[PDB]
Amino acid sequence: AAPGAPRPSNSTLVDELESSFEACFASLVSQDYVNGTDQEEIRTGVDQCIQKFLDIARQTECFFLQKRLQLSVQKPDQVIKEDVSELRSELQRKDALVQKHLTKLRHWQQVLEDINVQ
């Protein structure tokens, strides 16, 4: 059924990411003896594991982006609230940076007065 044109399959793209992650790690540690000889046999496996990992990460990001677009075109109020929260965070960061710069400037004023005191 696998080699043919149809391919019924489900229950993936959720834990399959962790499966592919843990895949190219048991070859490192297992309850089996490890032969003391290896020459480019590991690259053929790690390349496949890494490309599958990148592919499944891109699949997950595409699923998230699709849900993002669906909920945005459906209910943009979430996008408005997100922009509001981003503006709040930007204002808070700006205020914190301003307070730190003011503290530094006041300290420098104090030490400058002390140096001019001679």
Partner: protein, 266 residues
Amino acid sequence: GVNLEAFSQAISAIQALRSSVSRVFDCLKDGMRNKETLEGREKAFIANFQDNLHSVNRDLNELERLSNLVGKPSENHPLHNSGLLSLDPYSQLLQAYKWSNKLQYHAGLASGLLNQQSLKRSANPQYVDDVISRIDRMFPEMSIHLSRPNGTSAMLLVTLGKVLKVIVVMRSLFIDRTIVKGYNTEDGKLDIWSKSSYQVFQKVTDHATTALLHYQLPQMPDVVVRSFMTWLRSYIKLFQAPCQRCGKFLQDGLPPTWRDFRTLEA
């Protein structure tokens, strides 16, 4: 110890010799399947002899021969076999060696192919600098030194083989504002900013600035300064210019891609 690769090549060669012998004797065990015009497949027999001529390739091992003939009785290995007979659990040491080498090569290939990053952005120490500079100074023919005459920033100078010394101002990392000066240098009482050149060393400084703006990484300044030092040291020859003649312009120096070639070639 690259002789291990030579011995592995010899093993592959003799195994290929055995395989070629088996293959030619098997082919001799069969005739013309379907020719209908001429049994030219017998020529493949001669071609099989070429693979038997690959036995002379094993003779090439005589060039790779004399790889190891010394004392050092197995390099501090025997502990239980040549030592305490009761100490039988030794081979765990070799197992750990193989495990470590496998992990090292695996992670190396992984980091090499992980260049395809997937992190969009980040959203919701002078002693260390001197130590990094001294550690980078550990390569031969790359005598560098720093003095920091002005400012808390780092003032580093490098002199590799000639009077083409280069200065690079750093901010504990991502050393920008490069200035190379061939044959004078530290005029006045400290590093200078004359930046005078022969219309070619100034081009070299432009290349260095381009690389610094190019080899800038988001973090891990160690790899950054390492790539910087290698990229600068790659200029030790300035004697060859592929893809053109040796006189395409005033001078032909631009190795940005790990290989020098004729200038004005992007």
